[PDB]
């Protein structure tokens, strides 16, 4: 048989068979419902629209995200998302396919318990497993040591790993992610005169952020340059025409990662959290952690993020140490690649959670050695 690798993530569901080079189906994790009445008779529109289908009908629907920060809030629509992924995008019955999932570090145990219960009862998969996103990302890069930063749309966390041995006491998890950056961009575009309120226009703001924003190596110098020069403004075309322009907001939005005080967060920037997590570890492994800094996640795809992060870490770390940041082109798909590699291993075949084993041991077995 073959294994199935599913990555629920947050804001983008990516799934595909184990052993493939890239995920087969990638679509937003969005479930929508029509807020209007509808006058045409015989149309027979169904109650709920899920996946990329709801994106095309954005103007009529309202969008709800079942995942806020890693955790799942609404479970019925989560079941709808999983059913859609299993039946329409992959067109495969999950009755004969083991399923591997990704789960962010430091999340409630009830999340894992309900996930396993749903996957074993509703879909009756023969076996399934849950793995950490950072470990899979380290699998994809081909490394075996080094501290990995996984900044997705839901949560940003650092996991220091040395020689295949994780250090749980040095794991730091931060709630700043892509969704908060999009919300801050919405809040900051009001200054120029553009107002976005409807959840449909959240997607437009997200597209603007993806296609236009960039990270500045130096902040005050860039502010001084933009206050006089006009070479930074770029124009974007809304779906209904009405071209707009944007200036300082082009690079002010991604600065929130390094300046959490912009959105009122107390914590420090990612550049400081990475250094603090490195210093929380031992002293004999800091060379490899410094020299094998790995980036991943969609939010990392900002151009110029690597240079700024390296500059900050070098400004923090001692000058003797060599600081290297690994930024593969396929950052946002690294976790799924690592999951496919992990599920394709021969020695992993005896680490699944079987059906009868779960039945006899109950849902609490997830937290046992079968982590």
């Amino acid at each position: 048989t073959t294994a199935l690798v599913c990555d629920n993530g947050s804001g983008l569901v990516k799934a595909g068979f184990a052993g493939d080079d890239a995920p087969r189906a990638v679509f937003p994790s969005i479930v929508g419902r029509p807020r209007h009445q509808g006058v045409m008779v015989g149309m027979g529109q169904k109650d709920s629209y899920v996946g990329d289908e709801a994106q095309s009908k954005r103007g009529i629907l309202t969008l709800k995200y079942p995942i806020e920060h890693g955790i799942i809030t609404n479970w019925d629509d989560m079941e709808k998302i999983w059913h859609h992924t299993f039946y329409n995008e992959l067109r495969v019955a999950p009755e004969e396919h083991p399923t591997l999932l990704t789960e962010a570090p430091l999340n409630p145990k009830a999340n894992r318990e309900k996930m396993t219960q749903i996957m074993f009862e509703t879909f009756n998969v023969p076996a399934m497993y849950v793995a950490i996103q950072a470990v899979l990302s380290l699998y994809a890069s081909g490394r075996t040591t080094g501290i990995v930063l996984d900044s997705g749309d839901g949560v940003t966390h650092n996991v220091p790993i040395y020689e295949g041995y994780a250090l749980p006491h040095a794991i730091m998890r931060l709630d700043l992610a892509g969704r908060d950056l999009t919300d801050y961009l919405m809040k900051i575009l009001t200054e120029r005169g553009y107002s976005f309120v409807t959840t449909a226009e959240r997607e437009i703001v997200r597209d603007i952020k993806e296609k236009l924003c960039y990270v500045a190596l130096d902040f005050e110098n860039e502010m001084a340059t933009a206050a006089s020069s006009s070479s930074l403004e770029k124009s974007y075309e809304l779906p209904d025409g009405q071209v707009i322009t944007i200036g300082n907001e082009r690079f002010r939005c991604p600065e929130t990662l390094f300046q959490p005080s912009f959105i009122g967060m107390e914590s420090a920037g990612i550049h400081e959290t990475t250094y603090n997590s490195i210093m929380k570890c031992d002293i004999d492994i800091r060379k490899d952690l410094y020299a094998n800094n790995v980036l991943s996640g969609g939010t990392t795809m900002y151009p110029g993020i690597a240079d700024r992060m390296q500059k900050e870490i070098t400004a923090l770390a001692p000058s003797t140490m060599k600081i290297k940041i690994i930024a593969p082109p396929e950052r946002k798909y690294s976790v799924w690649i690592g999951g496919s590699i992990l599920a394709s291993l021969s020695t992993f075949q005896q680490m699944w959670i079987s059906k009868q084993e779960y039945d006899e041991a109950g849902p609490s077995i997830v937290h046992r050695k079968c982590f």
Partner: protein, 70 residues
């Protein structure tokens, strides 16, 4: 009598519309290439200043170690 004039006008309109559409398509292609090149060159210019500072204080502490060896 005017039917031929209308047909010719329609054909000309179609021809200029196709030429214009090709013109945009090339314009977005060239613009995307230009922005990608500009981003790449700006990033590597920033690399240039950082390696320049690297090199500068490299000769700084090299010279300091030089008189130390003296």
């Amino acid at each position: 009598s005017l039917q031929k004039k209308l047909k010719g006008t329609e054909d000309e309109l179609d021809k200029y519309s196709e030429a214009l559409k090709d013109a945009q398509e090339k314009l977005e292609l060239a613009e995307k290439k230009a922005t990608d090149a500009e981003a790449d060159v700006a990033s590597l210019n920033r690399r240039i200043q950082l390696v320049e500072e690297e090199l500068d204080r490299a000769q700084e502490r090299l010279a300091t170690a030089l008189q130390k060896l003296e």
